[PDB]
């Protein structure tokens, strides 16, 4: 499912997840998975 992981130890996990998913607000970190909308 995931675009990439979300690691809480990476304080920029939400920005990286957005980058994976195409830009601002497009990715959500839901537990250990970055999921694209």
From Swiss-Prot:
Which cysteines pair up through disulfides? They are: 3-20, 6-29, 17-34, 21-36
Q: Where in the cell is it found?
A: Secreted
Source domain of life is Eukaryota
Recorded hits in PROSITE patterns, A to Z, give: SHORT_SCORPION_CHLORIDE (PS51200)
A molecular function annotated in GO for this UniProt entry is:
toxin activity
Q: State whether keyword RNA-binding applies.
A: no
Its cellular-component GO annotations read: extracellular region
Question: Any idea which UniProt keywords this protein has?
Answer: Chloride channel impairing toxin, Disulfide bond, Ion channel impairing toxin, Knottin, Metalloenzyme inhibitor, Metalloprotease inhibitor, Neurotoxin, Protease inhibitor, Secreted, Toxin, Voltage-gated chloride channel impairing toxin
Q: In which tissues is it expressed?
A: Expressed by the venom gland.
User: Pfam families from the entry?
Assistant: Toxin_5
Q: In practice, how is this protein used?
A: Is under several clinical trials (phase I, II and III) as BLZ-100 (Tozuleristide) by Blaze Bioscience Inc. as a fluorescent imaging agent that labels tumor tissue (CNS, oral cavity squamous cells, breast, skin) to enable more complete and precise surgical resection. BLZ-100 is composed of the chlorotoxin peptide covalently congujated to a derivative of the fluorescent dye indocyanine green.
Question: What main location does UniProt list?
Answer: secreted
> Cross-referenced SUPFAM superfamilies, in alphabetical order?
Scorpion toxin-like
Keyword presence, ATP-binding = no
Role of this protein? This toxin binds to the surface of glioma cells, and inhibits their proliferation without having effects on normal brain cells. In this context, this toxin has been described as a chloride channel inhibitor (probably ClC-3/CLCN3) by causing its internalization via caveolae. It has also been described to selectively interact with MMP2 (in complex with MT1-MMP (MMP14) and TIMP2), to inhibit its enzymatic activity and to decrease its presence at the cell surface.
Q: What is known of its domains?
A: The presence of a 'disulfide through disulfide knot' structurally defines this protein as a knottin.
Q: Any other comment in the entry?
A: Negative results: does not interact with MMP-1, MMP-3 and MMP-9.
Tell me the protein family, please: Belongs to the short scorpion toxin superfamily. Chloride channel inhibitor family.
Name of the protein this chain belongs to: Chlorotoxin
| Naturally occurring in which organism (per UniProt) | Leiurus quinquestriatus quinquestriatus
């Amino acid at each position: 499912a995931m675009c990439m992981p979300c690691f809480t130890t990476d304080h920029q996990m939400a920005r990286k997840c957005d980058d994976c998913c195409g830009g601002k607000g497009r990715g959500k970190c839901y537990g250990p998975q970055c999921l694209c909308r």
